[PDB]
Design an enzyme around this catalytic site. Structure first.
Site, PDB file in Angstrom:
ATOM      1  CG  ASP A   1      -1.933  -8.958  -7.088  1.00 14.35           C
ATOM      2  OD1 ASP A   1      -2.713  -8.958  -6.126  1.00 14.35           O
ATOM      3  OD2 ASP A   1      -2.171  -9.442  -8.249  1.00 14.35           O
TER       4      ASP A   1
ATOM      5  CG  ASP B   1     -10.449 -13.879  -4.260  1.00 14.98           C
ATOM      6  OD1 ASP B   1     -11.364 -14.027  -5.042  1.00 14.98           O
ATOM      7  OD2 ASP B   1      -9.437 -14.491  -4.368  1.00 14.98           O
TER       8      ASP B   1
ATOM      9  CG  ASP C   1      -1.824  -1.260   1.217  1.00 16.75           C
ATOM     10  OD1 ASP C   1      -1.305  -2.347   0.883  1.00 16.75           O
ATOM     11  OD2 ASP C   1      -3.010  -1.163   1.595  1.00 16.75           O
TER      12      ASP C   1
END
Ligand SMILES: [N+]
Ligand SMILES: [N+]
Ligand SMILES: [N+]
Ligand SMILES: [N+]
Length: 322
Positions: A121, A282, A79
């Site tokens: 990712d 998820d 993040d």
């Protein structure tokens, strides 16, 4: 001897086995009979929290000569908004500690055959996420990936696949994706990758993924990265996705079972692999706006937790059928 480690019996692990046991105990008759067949389908083992360093050995002890598939998923921050201070103490160093531990354990099993899939990712966001904030995180992510490949990518008993998202995300950006990847490999020392993984945790069809692999490969060759092979996550892609919704997509099915060299018309494709663990959530339905989409299955538990009703749907929607 072969550099495609999927040309070997694949390891089926106790965690997945135990998760499907959970579902089986909740099912009767035909559905239960189909769950008992899904129990032994090999699935990757994720290294996804600090203590997963201590989980490697048991997998490798239980696998014997069978191919182990790990997913390295340890980058300590994904993040942005660091943002300080400043904005890390200290992510890269702690990540290098995780990698060394895992590499040190792997050197102890010279006779194991290990596939390491690096950090799903990360490449997607390095290509497409906008990085005023994230620029500090972005630079640290590239260094994390180079360091991981520089270690695993020199181990004779390991074949490394770098994750590169999915066609739905990066096929219209294949050139910038290749540019990113080549920069990371340039700083990865003597580390070598077998290839690229795609569709991890996502639901794109094999056929469109392979068109993505062809485009990314062409772009990688253009940057001087030659010889790459690909694996694609077929855990949840038995049915074409209705939308771009990532989170516990409704109407997904289990896809093709794990198999090496599955089509001679897809020479770049080393294997279908179940990378994402089918039936693990998820994310909790309340944890992200996308998990409230009308086509996200509600009632989901936290990311990584077994989601029995989602597993059932996957089994019912399996293509090909169990
Ligand atoms: N192969
Ligand atoms: N081994
Ligand atoms: N992926
Ligand atoms: N699917």
């Amino acid at each position: 001897t072969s550099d495609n480690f999927f040309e070997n019996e694949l390891y089926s692990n106790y965690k997945f086995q135990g998760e499907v046991d959970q579902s089986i105990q909740r099912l009767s008759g035909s559905l239960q009979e189909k769950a008992k067949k899904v129990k032994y389908v090999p699935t990757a083992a994720w290294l996804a929290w600090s203590g997963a360093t201590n989980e490697v050995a048991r997998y490798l002890n239980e696998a014997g000569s069978k191919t182990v598939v790990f997913v390295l998923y340890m980058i300590p921050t994904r993040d942005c908004n660091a943002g300080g201070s400043n904005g890390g103490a200290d992510n890269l160093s702690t990540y290098q500690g995780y990698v060394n531990s895992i590499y040190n354990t792997i050197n102890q099993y010279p006779n194991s055959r290990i596939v390491m899939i690096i950090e799903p990712d990360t490449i997607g966001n390095l290509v497409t996420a906008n990085n005023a904030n994230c620029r500090n995180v972005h630079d640290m992510h590239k260094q994390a990936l180079s360091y991981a490949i520089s270690k695993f990518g020199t181990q004779k008993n390991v074949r490394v696949y770098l994750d590169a998202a999915h066609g739905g995300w990066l096929n219209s950006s294949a050139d910038r994706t290749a540019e990113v990847i080549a920069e990371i490999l340039r700083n990865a020392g003597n580390g070598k990758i077998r290839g690229i993984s795609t569709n991890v945790s996502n639901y794109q069809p094999v056929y469109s993924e392979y068109q993505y692999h062809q485009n990314l490969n062409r772009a990688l060759e253009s940057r001087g990265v030659r010889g790459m092979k690909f694996i694609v996550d077929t855990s949840r892609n038995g049915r074409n996705p209705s939308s771009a919704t990532w989170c516990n997509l409704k109407g997904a099915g289990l896809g093709a079972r794990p198999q090496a060299n599955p089509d001679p018309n897809m020479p770049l494709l080393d294997a279908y692999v179940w990378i994402k663990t089918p039936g693990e959530s998820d994310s909790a339905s309340s944890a992200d706006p996308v998990c409230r989409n009308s086509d996200s299955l509600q009632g989901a538990p936290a990311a990584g937790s077994w989601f029995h009703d989602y597993f059932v749907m996957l089994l019912e929607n399996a293509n090909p059928p169990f």
